[PDB]
Amino acid sequence: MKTQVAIIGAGPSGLLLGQLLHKAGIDNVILERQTPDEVLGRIRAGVLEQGMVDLLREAGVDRRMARDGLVHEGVEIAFAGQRRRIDLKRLSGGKTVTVYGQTEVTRDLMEAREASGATTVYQAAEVRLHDLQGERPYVTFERDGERLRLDCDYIAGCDGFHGISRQSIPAERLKVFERVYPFGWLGLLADTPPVSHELIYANHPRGFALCSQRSATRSRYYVQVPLTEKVEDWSDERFWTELKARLPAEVAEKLVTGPSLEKSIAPLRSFVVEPMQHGRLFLAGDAAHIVPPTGAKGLNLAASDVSTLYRLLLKAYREGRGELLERYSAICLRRIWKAERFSWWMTSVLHRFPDTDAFSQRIQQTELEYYLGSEAGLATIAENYVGLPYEE
Amino acid sequence: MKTQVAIIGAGPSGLLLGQLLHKAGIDNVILERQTPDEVLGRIRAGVLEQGMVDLLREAGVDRRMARDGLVHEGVEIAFAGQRRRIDLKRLSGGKTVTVYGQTEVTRDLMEAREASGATTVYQAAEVRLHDLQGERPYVTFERDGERLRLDCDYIAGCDGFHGISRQSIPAERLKVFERVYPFGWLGLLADTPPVSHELIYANHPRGFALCSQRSATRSRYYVQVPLTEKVEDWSDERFWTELKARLPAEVAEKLVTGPSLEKSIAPLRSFVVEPMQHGRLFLAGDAAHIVPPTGAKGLNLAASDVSTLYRLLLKAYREGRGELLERYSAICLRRIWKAERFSWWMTSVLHRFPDTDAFSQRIQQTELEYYLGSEAGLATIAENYVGLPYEE
Ligand SMILES: Cc1cc2nc3c(=O)[nH]c(=O)nc-3n(C[C@H](O)[C@H](O)[C@H](O)COP(=O)(O)OP(=O)(O)OC[C@H]3O[C@@H](n4cnc5c(N)ncnc54)[C@H](O)[C@@H]3O)c2cc1C
Numbered sequence A, B: 001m002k003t004q005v006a007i008i009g010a011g012p013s014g015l016l017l018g019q020l021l022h023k024a025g026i027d028n029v030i031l032e033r034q035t036p037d038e039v040l041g042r043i044r045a046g047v048l049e050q051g052m053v054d055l056l057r058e059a060g061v062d063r064r065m066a067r068d069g070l071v072h073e074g075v076e077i078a079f080a081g082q083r084r085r086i087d088l089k090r091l092s093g094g095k096t097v098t099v100y101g102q103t104e105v106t107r108d109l110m111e112a113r114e115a116s117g118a119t120t121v122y123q124a125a126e127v128r129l130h131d132l133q134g135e136r137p138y139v140t141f142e143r144d145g146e147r148l149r150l151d152c153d154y155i156a157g158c159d160g161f162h163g164i165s166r167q168s169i170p171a172e173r174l175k176v177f178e179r180v181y182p183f184g185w186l187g188l189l190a191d192t193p194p195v196s197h198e199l200i201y202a203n204h205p206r207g208f209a210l211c212s213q214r215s216a217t218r219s220r221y222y223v224q225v226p227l228t229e230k231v232e233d234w235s236d237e238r239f240w241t242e243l244k245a246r247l248p249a250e251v252a253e254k255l256v257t258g259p260s261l262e263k264s265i266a267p268l269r270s271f272v273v274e275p276m277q278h279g280r281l282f283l284a285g286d287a288a289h290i291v292p293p294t295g296a297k298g299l300n301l302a303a304s305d306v307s308t309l310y311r312l313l314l315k316a317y318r319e320g321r322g323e324l325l326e327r328y329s330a331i332c333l334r335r336i337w338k339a340e341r342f343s344w345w346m347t348s349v350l351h352r353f354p355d356t357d358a359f360s361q362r363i364q365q366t367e368l369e370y371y372l373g374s375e376a377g378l379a380t381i382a383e384n385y386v387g388l389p390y391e392e
């Protein structure tokens, strides 16, 4: 087999990069470890920045989104018996965010690709990357017992945090920045109407809580829990009682509960690797970095990396300007660090940290009061939340 | 599930550690990604140090070895139209090495374990290690769709170069030392009698060649080839002609050729990670380090790591001396660096390096002439080849 751009991983980053490339005439093959079903079983993200919305429209996969996505003009932070709303539309200069599930985005891309006829090998086991610094790198994998080889010009590692790509770069070539938080998020997907028309982030003495949604009849709730918790110890019943305890009385009494469709614990972490490339291999999305879900930036940073790599591969192929690829990491890291800073900030002011002295608790409370009461303060949250501009 | 020591990987390191532990009364569970067959298909090693031979006898798996293993008292280096023999037995003070295939060693251990009834889960997918710095770490994996959890006291990462263990330690906690060589080894297993009763390492202008064996009717040959070669480009016919071209005329004319049972290319590399542990996780064998096969140290260093970890776990469990585990990395690295140095030395004097000036070629030749003609020189090769003493 031979192609122009080999893509490792069929999550949103890979499918999105593959769809854009295909549309521009650049051949690409996607290699996924799992089955289409397993990829589709992941709930994950729900909030999309305008940049991603526009990127999906450019990739030609925005129909269902334009119809089912919910445009949100504000969010709400609850703390100290208060409920403060941030008017995103007004404070950011007209921008908004779109609520549309990652599963849906993934499904839409899978369908578009199926129709296009571009190559996709699911259940590609034992993927190994070779000759990364050569002019002709290649990928080897096993498909039903037989080992195949795939020759290509460039490789895009879109295999997530545990992918083979990042591990295929000499350890001494990368500098890792990581921070692990002492808690996780217990999420619950239910087929019930959301308690609010906008999201509610809540700082509460018992810990953090978040009220989200997927549609007008499908909700997604989370509560901060210790890393020692097991999902089997949390019955639907127990989850509902705890969520209620962490929300304002008026919000709690309007909550329509119900049996969960999904329940899982996601630990929180910040992770950036520098640089994001090695020879003919370029890392994108979770393969290169992780952000706590608090600021809703994961999927959104994957989109900016992908938009960047796509636009650089277009110049290389279409205009013979391959030197531009050297710039991939610099351009991307600028946006990544700012989104990492915001997600870190959000996480620190909304969560309950263990072993926090009196002074720190007061400063945490004051951070909220100040930022949520100052016009200049609200703007810093809004412009970061809607998403900082993509660099050209 | 719950056990005392969870072991990731059923290659020789894992099976050996598991066998010794079981014998001493310490419960252990082995988790292997592949099937017993795939593990058994790997040819690999053929030369064993006395330390490993004694370790197998202690593990109670030495019968077949004592019967089928071939004790070798010397090896031979051919260069510049000369054939110099190193009397290992004499120069090292009585020590020798044993020729017995890794496949055989693996088979013997698999059988011993099967009989013992100790737990072994093959095809354990998605292995993930958790709470490494806690008092109660655990392992999660999938067995036929269902995700199981395994609680344990300690975890021994014996999953080889591409295992999950080394990747589960925070990147910032490890310092990697690596060197990749510009060539690989094309190996060929044949059902023919070996050209010699002892091994012949050959430095030749066309490149390196090695004449080895598995028994009196089974041989294993290798020739150095560029990293750009594909095994499908090397027919048996082509391999035999090239091997012949790289050996002394008298050795070449006594060669019994024949169809290959196996053919594969192994790239060469040196790799050491420091330290070799993190909390309740200890790395052993290829999970922690790689050596070029030139000095025959890979499997042999796995044995010393395992012997060390085993003896430390015995004090921890039997004598309640768990503080001793802190010493694992220090003890092991001392032996590892010396074996890395020897394997590096062997590789540099026997191989053909690209872009070598006149001076370097002459020094390479002089290294051989000196070391192979000096009694003190031969001793340095012999004592290192038979294997340096295990530290207590
Ligand atoms: C609870 C939670 C809430 C979140 N909320 C938001 C939100 O509201 N908005 C937002 O922007 N972000 C959010 N995020 C994050 C977002 O889900 C991820 O950043 C995003 O899925 C990353 O996409 P990816 O394509 O880089 O990687 P992935 O989705 O992880 O996919 C990588 C793909 O590569 C495959 N793969 C792995 N190894 C190999 C291999 N060796 N060979 C081949 N294939 C391989 C994997 O199977 C996988 O299919 C949230 C995350 C979580 C967990």
Ligand SMILES: Cc1cc2nc3c(=O)[nH]c(=O)nc-3n(C[C@H](O)[C@H](O)[C@H](O)COP(=O)(O)OP(=O)(O)OC[C@H]3O[C@@H](n4cnc5c(N)ncnc54)[C@H](O)[C@@H]3O)c2cc1C
Binding pocket: B008, B009, B010, B011, B012, B013, B014, B031, B032, B033, B034, B039, B044, B045, B046, B047, B048, B102, B124, B127, B158, B159, B160, B161, B162, B163, B164, B185, B187, B266, B284, B285, B286, B287, B293, B296, B297, B298, B299, B300, B301, B302
């Ligand atoms: C051509 C060649 C010649 C050699 N010659 C010699 C010689 O003469 N003498 C000598 O001492 N050395 C020699 N060596 C080296 C030796 O073969 C290795 O050092 C040895 O096999 C290492 O044993 P191990 O148990 O650490 O790892 P491995 O043999 O690699 O086994 C690791 C096991 O872990 C499993 N695993 C991997 N990932 C996971 C996961 N995520 N979950 C669970 N299981 C997992 C793997 O499937 C594998 O079964 C040679 C090597 C080669 C390649």
